[PDB]
Amino acid sequence: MITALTALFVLVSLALVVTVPVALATPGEWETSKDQFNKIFQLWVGLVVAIATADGIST
Amino acid sequence: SPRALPFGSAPATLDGSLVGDVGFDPIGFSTAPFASFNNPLYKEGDFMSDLEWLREAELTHGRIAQLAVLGFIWPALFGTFPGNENFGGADAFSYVNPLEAITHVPDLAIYQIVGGMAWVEYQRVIRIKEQGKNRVSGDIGLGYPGGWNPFNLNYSPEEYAEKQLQEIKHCRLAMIGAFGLFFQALNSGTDIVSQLSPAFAAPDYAAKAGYFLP
Amino acid sequence: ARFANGKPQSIEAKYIMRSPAEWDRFMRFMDRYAEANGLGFSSXXXXXXX
Amino acid sequence: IAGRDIESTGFAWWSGNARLINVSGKLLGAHVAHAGLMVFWAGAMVLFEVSHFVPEKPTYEQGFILIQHLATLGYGIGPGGEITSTVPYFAVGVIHLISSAILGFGGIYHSLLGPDTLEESFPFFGYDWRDKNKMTTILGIHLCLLGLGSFLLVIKAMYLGGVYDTWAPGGGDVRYITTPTLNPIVIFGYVFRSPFGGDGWVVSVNNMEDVIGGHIWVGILCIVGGIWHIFTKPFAWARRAFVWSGEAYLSYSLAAISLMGFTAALYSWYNNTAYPSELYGPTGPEASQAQAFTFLVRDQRLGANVSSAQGPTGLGKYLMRSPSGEIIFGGETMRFWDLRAPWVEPLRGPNGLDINKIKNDIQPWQERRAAEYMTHAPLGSLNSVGGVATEINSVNYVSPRSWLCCSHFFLAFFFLVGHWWHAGRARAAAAGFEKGIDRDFEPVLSMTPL
Amino acid sequence: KLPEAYAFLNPIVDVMPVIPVLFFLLAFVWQAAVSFR
Amino acid sequence: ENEIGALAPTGFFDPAKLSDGISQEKFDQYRLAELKHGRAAMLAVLGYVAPETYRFGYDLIPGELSTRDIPNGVAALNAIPFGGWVQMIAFVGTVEAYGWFTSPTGVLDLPADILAKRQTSELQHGRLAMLAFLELIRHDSQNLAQPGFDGYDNLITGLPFLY
Amino acid sequence: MLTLKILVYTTVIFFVSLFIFGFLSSDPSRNPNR
Amino acid sequence: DTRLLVIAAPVLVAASWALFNIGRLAIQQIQRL
Ligand code: CLA
Numbered sequence A: 001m002i003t004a005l006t007a008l009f010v011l012v013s014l015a016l017v018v019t020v021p022v023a024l025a026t027p028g029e030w031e032t033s034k035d036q037f038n039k040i041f042q043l044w045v046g047l048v049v050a051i052a053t054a055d056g057i058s059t
Numbered sequence B: 001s002p003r004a005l006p007f008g009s010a011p012a013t014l015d016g017s018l019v020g021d022v023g024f025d026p027i028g029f030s031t032a033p034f035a036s037f038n039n040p041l042y043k044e045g046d047f048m049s050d051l052e053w054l055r056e057a058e059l060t061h062g063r064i065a066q067l068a069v070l071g072f073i074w075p076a077l078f079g080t081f082p083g084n085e086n087f088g089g090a091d092a093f094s095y096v097n098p099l100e101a102i103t104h105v106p107d108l109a110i111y112q113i114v115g116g117m118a119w120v121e122y123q124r125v126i127r128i129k130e131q132g133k134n135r136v137s138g139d140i141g142l143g144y145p146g147g148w149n150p151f152n153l154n155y156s157p158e159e160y161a162e163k164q165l166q167e168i169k170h171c172r173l174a175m176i177g178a179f180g181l182f183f184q185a186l187n188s189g190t191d192i193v194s195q196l197s198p199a200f201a202a203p204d205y206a207a208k209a210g211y212f213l214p
Numbered sequence C: 001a002r003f004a005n006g007k008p009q010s011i012e013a014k015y016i017m018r019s020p021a022e023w024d025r026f027m028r029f030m031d032r033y034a035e036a037n038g039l040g041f042s043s044x045x046x047x048x049x050x
Numbered sequence D: 001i002a003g004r005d006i007e008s009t010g011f012a013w014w015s016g017n018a019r020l021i022n023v024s025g026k027l028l029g030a031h032v033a034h035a036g037l038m039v040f041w042a043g044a045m046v047l048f049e050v051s052h053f054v055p056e057k058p059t060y061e062q063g064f065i066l067i068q069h070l071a072t073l074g075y076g077i078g079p080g081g082e083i084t085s086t087v088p089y090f091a092v093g094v095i096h097l098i099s100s101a102i103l104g105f106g107g108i109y110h111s112l113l114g115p116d117t118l119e120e121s122f123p124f125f126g127y128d129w130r131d132k133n134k135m136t137t138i139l140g141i142h143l144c145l146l147g148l149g150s151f152l153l154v155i156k157a158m159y160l161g162g163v164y165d166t167w168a169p170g171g172g173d174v175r176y177i178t179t180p181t182l183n184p185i186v187i188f189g190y191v192f193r194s195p196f197g198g199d200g201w202v203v204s205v206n207n208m209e210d211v212i213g214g215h216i217w218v219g220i221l222c223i224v225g226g227i228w229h230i231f232t233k234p235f236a237w238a239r240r241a242f243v244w245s246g247e248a249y250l251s252y253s254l255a256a257i258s259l260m261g262f263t264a265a266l267y268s269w270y271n272n273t274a275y276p277s278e279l280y281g282p283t284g285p286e287a288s289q290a291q292a293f294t295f296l297v298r299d300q301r302l303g304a305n306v307s308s309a310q311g312p313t314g315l316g317k318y319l320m321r322s323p324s325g326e327i328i329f330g331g332e333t334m335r336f337w338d339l340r341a342p343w344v345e346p347l348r349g350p351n352g353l354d355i356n357k358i359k360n361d362i363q364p365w366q367e368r369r370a371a372e373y374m375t376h377a378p379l380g381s382l383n384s385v386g387g388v389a390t391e392i393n394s395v396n397y398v399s400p401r402s403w404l405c406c407s408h409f410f411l412a413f414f415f416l417v418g419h420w421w422h423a424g425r426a427r428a429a430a431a432g433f434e435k436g437i438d439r440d441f442e443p444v445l446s447m448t449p450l
Numbered sequence E: 001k002l003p004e005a006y007a008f009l010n011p012i013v014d015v016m017p018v019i020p021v022l023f024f025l026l027a028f029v030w031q032a033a034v035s036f037r
Numbered sequence F: 001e002n003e004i005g006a007l008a009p010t011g012f013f014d015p016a017k018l019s020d021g022i023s024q025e026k027f028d029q030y031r032l033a034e035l036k037h038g039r040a041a042m043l044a045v046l047g048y049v050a051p052e053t054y055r056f057g058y059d060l061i062p063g064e065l066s067t068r069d070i071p072n073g074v075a076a077l078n079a080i081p082f083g084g085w086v087q088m089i090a091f092v093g094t095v096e097a098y099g100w101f102t103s104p105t106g107v108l109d110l111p112a113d114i115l116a117k118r119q120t121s122e123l124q125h126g127r128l129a130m131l132a133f134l135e136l137i138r139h140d141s142q143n144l145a146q147p148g149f150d151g152y153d154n155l156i157t158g159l160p161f162l163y
Numbered sequence G: 001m002l003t004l005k006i007l008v009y010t011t012v013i014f015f016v017s018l019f020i021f022g023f024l025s026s027d028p029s030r031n032p033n034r
Numbered sequence H: 001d002t003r004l005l006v007i008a009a010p011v012l013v014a015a016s017w018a019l020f021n022i023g024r025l026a027i028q029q030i031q032r033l
């Protein structure tokens, strides 16, 4: 699972990095779309915690 | 409150009540009644100020602790314990470790200084019980402008203000320092001279011998 | 030579004599600069006030 | 775009970052983003080295540059410098990567959407480059942070598993430094000693006790200084000798960091204590001493009377006398007689290299260590051919000591150059003639002829 | 070698360390995009 | 029941019916309870650490049984005579029902803002001390079993300088 | 040769202190514009 | 099959083109480049 879990984490981090820099710049874009970014941030930290829990347990 | 710079002090802590009025009073027990706590010779009359009573408390503590500092250095450094006892090296000069010095000295001199400070506080209460208005740390005659003893204090009111500042500050800092020295010696079983002098030296383990060169 | 040495003073004479030169300089410098406490210029490298 | 054009600013695109001198928020964003870049490189390189790790070879043969630090801290290392596991390095790498992501986001936010000037909205993080109280406050805050970090290292070495100590009895291993040296005289003897041969200004720290004590002292000094600068204000004597502007502060920092870089470069080239030879490989002098030692042993096996064979010049080809009288190895390696290595100290007495110990009490592990160090000297080429410049290319090795020393020496000098440039420009700009002369108030025409 | 879980993700690590250099260049390409204003 | 007792960790931590209902009918009682518990457990932690370096030289049963010899930690409970701890508690219970010393009066003024903040901080600290007492007792008993079952032998696992 | 060391140690501290206190004597003010 | 080569080229790949993609999008959406 770990391997997969992380794969995801890599994919979601790529999707976040390609879109955060474009957001901030584009004037206004930010605020309007703030809650989805917050939700994706929570997803990201949840994925990190899940990966850490995998390892630990698996060792 | 500039002492506790990003904080508020008591709803009524004063700035001119005591010289040391920078505002440092975080829990600020000044607020609390600070009265004849457990009947501390209650008067209900002038009774000074509860803050001023805490001020007299700090003054007594800091003065005693200030004298205590010198009594932790001079037994070692200054006078190198001039105990010069007629006999009995123990309870005399020999114990240069202040804790051990107390451990030895007979209750004769203990009761001597005990009765000394006893008469001191007896006269202090004799003044203060009547010395209402400004209790002014139970000043009475002790080196006051009237100078109840030799070299009767001869200074100016601005010099007196600065002198009040000097005393108060030194007493507070010495209240820190006495704690310092005591916990030091107890947690090292020595006297301040011991650790400070090997410190300012070079350890015997490494000395590069001497210049025995040709 | 390789004897470590605080600074390089080996003889109390050497330290006590490297002393008066620095103190002589401190005195000549103090001759101009004395009794200075305030006069904050508050500017970019001004120090205009003597 | 008001602040981002040669017109509005007066600064060309190539010198574009100078437009942020008076912009507080964007400068903070740039600084934070750059710190994120540092952290990202650290994590990425640790992960790279862990990936390319090979358990057969020692770390100094694999071209590694970061595993050595974490091993010296006492992570996944066993007796003799053997690497047990590489899990803590992986953990450090991933933590650094995540933290770098956070820092990079913060830097981007503060550079793009953050307010340009922090003075208006947050009058606690705003500054002026000209008032001294706020500058000293920031300096003191960061100084306290540095002191806390030095404490953290001391705490790690004393009560958090300990650190790796080569001079430990029974060989190098992780141990707790129970009794660090706290004597101010011995600690500051390093600071105030000569930087020449036989002295080693701060590079010549020998035991771990001195390292821990010096770090305790540095942390205490930094904490006290940080508290002191926060409260006080620059004095009169320092108020008229310093240029008070952002570029001047940058130039001061550049000079200081160039000195630090030079010190670290020369520190990685000579030190065995904080740079164990089992991880970074032998130093320059160590390889030469190892060669002399191994050939002495080999010639002694044949039955030749060592310490009695005159050399070609009549000086003695195995044992000599140092200019101070100490007994040392002969040959060209007499210049390196100041060496002190854990594998050669057992043979040293108060008079120098003891002869009875050499003749009788020699050890096979010393022979193996000397042979390995001689066969791996800090010699190489840019393409990492390894060995002497005239050697054919079969081995592939350049010691990490050489890489570290060369790279950091280069960086240190170029930061000294940066100090020169920025100090000159800052003082000229403060004076007010950094753009030209005047053409109507030329000071040369107002001065006496000569 | 990486732990067995991440040996699959090894190739990303093979390129991760050289990222920063490219950031630098990005500055230059960004300046080129805005006509070296 | 969303009074004082909440902060950034949770705006009202009660993942059950417990909070809702008995509205100001058990909430005040639970505040009394949690207060007393957290205070006592704070005193517990201070208890454990202070016997490790200091020791008052009083002879609990005169002639013998001097503090300097009794084990610190759980053992003391086995050591301390049943009736001895009964008398100690009887003093404590009299104290609870007489206010004898222990600041019998005097709480200063503390305007309602600072007063509320101090009370909240108190609650939080005592809550934390409950968990601290928990870990301590755990380690103690576990070691008492297999001498170093936990591993780290010395009683106070953190604060290594002490032990 | 201790005398020679003494004389050189003087000369060196002499000139070094001259430098240090010359640059401390409000040097940035010394300048064409004021 | 040196899957290592087919794994190491395409990742260098995605990474090298990514930031320039960010530049694409910023210039397209009339951003404050
Ligand atoms: C570490 C290097 C570094 C950093 C931190 C900065 C930072 C900055 N520069 Mg800059 N610069 C640099 C190197 C750097 N520069 C170099 C090397 C040059 C020479 C070519 C310049 C030349 C230069 C000029 C000429 C100017 C700046 C300006 C600026 C400021 C505003 C930039 C702006 O508006 O972006 C706008 C650009 C974009 C929106 C496009 C970039 C898109 C993002 C930011 C790229 C990174 C995305 C990242 C990979 C995604 C990570 C997401 C995260 C969540 C993981 C900003 C503080 C300007 C200034 O003075 O501001 C007042 C200005 O005029 N710089």
Ligand code: CLA
Pocket: D014, D015, D016, D017, D018, D250, D254, D414, D415, D416, D417, D418, D419, D421, D425, E021
């Ligand atoms: C922490 C260190 C530091 C900081 C914060 C600054 C900050 C600054 N410097 Mg500066 N500088 C430094 C160190 C530093 N410098 C050092 C060490 C030197 C000596 C070389 C200089 C020499 C220097 C000069 C000569 C000038 C500045 C200038 C400036 C200002 C604008 C710079 C700018 O826009 O960058 C823009 C950045 C670039 C254009 C990037 C150029 C890339 C270089 C040339 C190549 C780097 C090679 C690299 C190591 C590897 C290449 C990899 C490649 C093969 C792919 C700014 C205040 C300018 C100024 O006066 O402003 C007032 C100016 O003219 N600096």
Ligand SMILES: CC(=O)O[C@H]1CC(C)(C)C(=C=C/C(C)=C/C=C/C(C)=C/C=C/C=C(C)/C=C/C=C(\C)C(=O)C[C@@]23O[C@]2(C)C[C@@H](O)CC3(C)C)[C@](C)(O)C1
Pocket: B066, B067, B069, B070, B142, B143, B144, B147, B148, B149, B150, B170, B171, B173, B174, B176, B177, B178, B180, B181, B184
């Ligand atoms: C007629 C008559 O009788 O009226 C009297 C009135 C009166 C007022 C009595 C008079 C007077 C004036 C008096 C008596 C003034 C007395 C003042 C006094 C005696 C003031 C002590 C301060 C000591 C301090 C602050 C602490 C220092 C030391 C500190 C804080 C340390 O740091 C100690 C440190 O040690 C540790 C902690 C550890 C070591 O590792 C390091 C060091 C060593 C650095 C007269 C003139 O006699 C007349």
Ligand SMILES: CC1=C(/C=C/C(C)=C/C=C/C(C)=C/C=C/C=C(C)/C=C/C=C(C)/C=C/C2=C(C)CCCC2(C)C)C(C)(C)CCC1
Pocket: A006, A009, A010, A013, A017, D030, D033, D034, D036, D037, D040, D047, D094, D097, D098, D100, D101, D103, D104, D105, D107, D108, D111, E006, E009, E012, E013, E023, E026, E027, E030
């Ligand atoms: C402002 C500006 C700039 C700058 C910027 C910056 C500097 C930024 C930074 C940024 C950053 C600094 C970022 C970072 C990021 C990071 C990340 C994003 C990370 C991630 C991670 C991950 C994803 C991981 C994963 C993993 C794991 C977990 C395990 C193992 C495997 C792996 C490794 C895969 C420039 C110059 C451009 C231009 C101008 C403007």
Ligand SMILES: [Cl-]
Pocket: D330, D331, D332, D333
């Ligand atoms: Cl040779």
